[model samples]
Target: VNSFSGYLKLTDNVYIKNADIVEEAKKVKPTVVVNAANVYLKHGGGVAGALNKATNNAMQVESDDYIATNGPLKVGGSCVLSGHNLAKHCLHVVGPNVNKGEDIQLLKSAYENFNQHEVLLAPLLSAGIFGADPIHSLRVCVDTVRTNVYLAVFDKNLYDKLVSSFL
Candidate 1:
């Protein structure tokens, strides 16, 4: 099916969903969508790019304006901006690039900083370009995030890996 494969219920509120993040977000209509954001909040590529394009660049412009007003986001820190065409808001968080240095604390911090929304859409933060393994990222997400979290997965192979390993 073109919908979700299935979801792994981690707790009462957390779940790892094997589905396209953007499409699922549209359906679920969560209050916040967590962007796998860079420090500069430039929605250029990867999941960030997809979300930026999906929102018609409104996210990028708002994020850019946010950077201009505040400073570049520190790793593990987050900022919220009004969402468009997806959730009611978008939580921009900077995850650690593992190649940079010791990243566990920073990565965990990134996951811990999620907005306390009833329903939130989140990607596998730092697993794409930031060098963390999908399992590791998923583990961190599982440990953190207190709200109703839908951890969206887009890749079939990765989904299989997660489902096999964690489910």
Candidate 2:
């Protein structure tokens, strides 16, 4: 069962935990739960798919409407969406695709874009198909996150890595 398994305090307002991010976000009730989103906001798989399904596809409808109105989001750009059954809102950030020569600054921008929101339930941005290294993502989160953030790490191996490297 993927549940909250305690956390390691990383800074004054940031903590990391091994748990299902959706379930953890439900408890935290953050102002925004970030979607490690694509430029199209398609919600195809990984965290995006799970969050979309959690909202019974309502998130997808909102995302589609956003795209229809705004066209594809540029890399490192973001837009807000109604949270439906999740948090108060959802922040969709288009992270850098490292395989395409994108670098840490763009990934940094993805996290920095969340600065307007006070509380966030965020996963490791750009660590999925975007090809960022997990520890590198952690470092960015460590640097950028202010206010309250519950950084969820679902993988046991990655959790341990973060624990060793961060704590």
Candidate 3:
């Protein structure tokens, strides 16, 4: 069995990422990812940028169109985007900016908005770029992501939650 495996009886369904998000997303070929998206959907830099180009700029325009009238995506809200590279859909969550004192609740909100997916490669809540604590961020995401199969990873490290997702 995978060493990085456990169970979050609280949520009863949350899981951890034991491989690359891109790799895992491809593994199941699922069309949904909890990407670190902003209001601009500026697929020009960071993970968002990487995703943009990876999907052949499939979600940028869709994101841009949504942002133009709706303004920046709400702090805790998300914009479902079309994908082509990894999958056919992406959950573009407006994650926190890379700054101190970021709100952890917003991170939770981003995860709560989604209902479920066969496979959702989740980002590290609000810690990656926002400087929020990784462990704390993961916990917050855990609390919000009540159900469904997910892959939550913090940088190169993968914490305990469940098995089979990463295997």
Candidate with top TM-score is: 2
Global Cα lDDT for candidate 1: 0.80
The CA root-mean-square deviation of candidate 1, after full C-alpha superposition on the true structure, stands at: 3.2
Give the per-residue lDDT of model 1 (tens digit) for 51-92: 899999989888888889898988998888887888888888
For residues 1-167, write the lDDT of model 2, one tens digit per residue: 22334877789877788877788777766678888899989998888898888888998898888889889998988988887778888898888878778766888888888788877788888986778898888888778867677788878888898789774
TM-score for candidate 1, residues paired by index? 0.89
Report the C-alpha lDDT of model 3 over 6-57, residue by residue, as the tens digit.
3233356666554556655555556577777766667676567766776667
TM-score of 3: 0.75
Alpha-carbon runs more than 4 Å astray in model 3: 1-11, 98-102, 116-119, 152-154, 157-167
Write the number of the candidate with greater TM-score, choosing between 2 and 3: 2
Report, for every candidate in turn, its global Cα lDDT versus the true structure: 0.80, 0.82, 0.63
Q: List clashing residue pairs in candidate 2.
A: none
List where candidate 1 sits over 4 angstroms from the true fold. Answer: 1-6, 99-102
TM-score per prediction, in order, is 0.89, 0.90, 0.75
